[PDB]
Design a protein around this ligand. Structure first.
Ligand SMILES: C[C@@H](O)CN1CCN(CC(=O)O)CCN(CC(=O)O)CCN(CC(=O)O)CC1
Ligand SMILES: C[C@@H](O)CN1CCN(CC(=O)O)CCN(CC(=O)O)CCN(CC(=O)O)CC1
Ligand SMILES: [Cl-]
Ligand SMILES: [Cl-]
Ligand SMILES: [Cl-]
Ligand SMILES: [Gd]
Ligand code: NA
Length: 128
């Protein structure tokens, strides 16, 4: 599923992501735009052999199981495929664990280089 901007803000806000660990709702919609282009089915191979999955591109090195990343962890206890669903529940619960772990939203390289220090509230402007 490719989400519209307002539609993704209303789903993230219903799943409790708004000001989660102090990060406003515009930071999460901003990240999703530059990680996946709002597309739940997005995948990218990394050079160490791990893969990023879904609307927030969550890494198979630590967070989920794809059966092809040797001696990796599955700390969200999910298959990688669960993070490709039109239902973003799996992805949101998985991102709450990651952003709680010491480094905050710096875990997302596109957040760090394209959303940190900008007008992030612009990403939810106009939505009800
Ligand atoms: C709502 C309109 O913006 C729709 N829109 C009209 C055309 N726009 C004109 C403009 O954006 O003022 C120029 C192209 N646009 C550039 C950009 O968005 O920054 C990329 C495509 N957009 C993506 C989007 O906006 O979600 C969809 C089409
Ligand atoms: C031509 C305009 O599209 C200029 N536009 C500024 C105003 N936009 C326009 C809008 O989408 O209504 C609203 C804010 N916008 C939200 C979003 O688009 O997703 C993020 C910033 N954008 C990034 C981008 O386009 O990729 C900068 C370019
Ligand atoms: Cl915001
Ligand atoms: Cl594996
Ligand atoms: Cl923080
Ligand atoms: Gd824009
Ligand atoms: Na894994």
């Amino acid at each position: 599923k490719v989400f519209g901007r307002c539609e993704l803000a209303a789903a993230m806000k219903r799943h409790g992501l708004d000001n989660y660990r102090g990060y406003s709702l515009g930071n999460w919609v901003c990240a999703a735009k530059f990680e996946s282009n709002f597309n739940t089915q997005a995948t990218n191979r990394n050079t160490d052999g791990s893969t990023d999955y879904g609307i927030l591109q969550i890494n198979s090195r630590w967070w989920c199981n794809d059966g092809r990343t040797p001696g990796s962890r599955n700390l969200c206890n999910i298959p990688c495929s669960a993070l490709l669903s039109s239902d973003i529940t799996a992805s949101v619960n998985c991102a709450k664990k990651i952003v709680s772990d010491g480094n905050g939203m710096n875990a997302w390289v596109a957040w760090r280089n394209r959303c940190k220090g900008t007008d992030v509230q612009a990403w939810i402007r106009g939505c009800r």
